[PDB]
Design a protein around this ligand. Sequence first.
Ligand SMILES: CC1(COc2ccc3c(c2)ncn3-c2ccc3cccc(N4CCC(N)CC4)c3n2)COC1
Length: 296
Amino acid sequence: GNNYSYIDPTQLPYDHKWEFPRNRLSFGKTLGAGAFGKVVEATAQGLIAAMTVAVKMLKPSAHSTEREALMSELKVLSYLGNHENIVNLLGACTHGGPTLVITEYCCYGDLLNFLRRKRDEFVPYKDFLTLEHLLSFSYQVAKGMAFLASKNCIHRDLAARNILLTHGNITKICDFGLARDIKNDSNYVDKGNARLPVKWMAPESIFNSVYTFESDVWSYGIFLWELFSLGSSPYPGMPVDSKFYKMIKEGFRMSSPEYAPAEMYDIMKTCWDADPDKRPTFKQIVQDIEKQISES
Ligand SMILES: CC1(COc2ccc3c(c2)ncn3-c2ccc3cccc(N4CCC(N)CC4)c3n2)COC1
């Protein structure tokens, strides 16, 4: 009985099959900077000639616990494996300097800014943005999240800003700094003291700091609202304050975006069930969207 346990991927050794020499890595422009650190475009010569990649790194002032967390994220990505709809791990630099995590590069950037740029040219039916594209995006994000859940992982920051768009209109979930394997407890209780994405969070995460497969599903529902509203900020007209929390707890939910199909707003509503047990799984969401695509 006690001779069997769940292998914790963050306790496994770093596998040097990922190691890439930093003297073949040339940094280009900065792609983003924030609590996650710094992300740059780069060329990784000979990782496969020259492929364009993204490289995540910490600020030079970073704490030892920040540095350990980047190593832990590397181990999580190493254990997770490859999927079409995530920003995949390609390599790392783990000695001779600060840790660098090398991942796929997505030339169109984040989906939120993409949507906000294409808002004015959007037309529901027929390059330009159409209802068909938005359904495809909903499907691909659900497939990436189903994959994470099939590996017993939660992302904890699902939002349009953390979805990237690459060639062929393929969407990829990015930023795994907060992702966790929850095989042992079937939840995660956040002990951190960082700023949190309150308007994307399930009420049980706000109130009790508990994260689960089902709280990722809540966030997916908020993502759907962002998507079909073409990049509107969620809960318009509502600051994050005592009024906001009271309303969410009492059962307030956002109305449908104008261009959301009724069956997609139906998914949103089940993602936001107050009872986590009544929310759908990503597996169920994928099957639902599949059938909507086929019926279109
Ligand atoms: C639009 C252009 C392209 O932009 C980009 C941006 C990030 C790009 C990118 C192309 N390929 C990849 N990544 C990544 C990769 C890992 C990341 C790990 C953590 C955080 C990230 N980001 C993106 C979203 C987040 N909300 C803010 C920081 C990350 N990004 C073409 O010139 C910019």
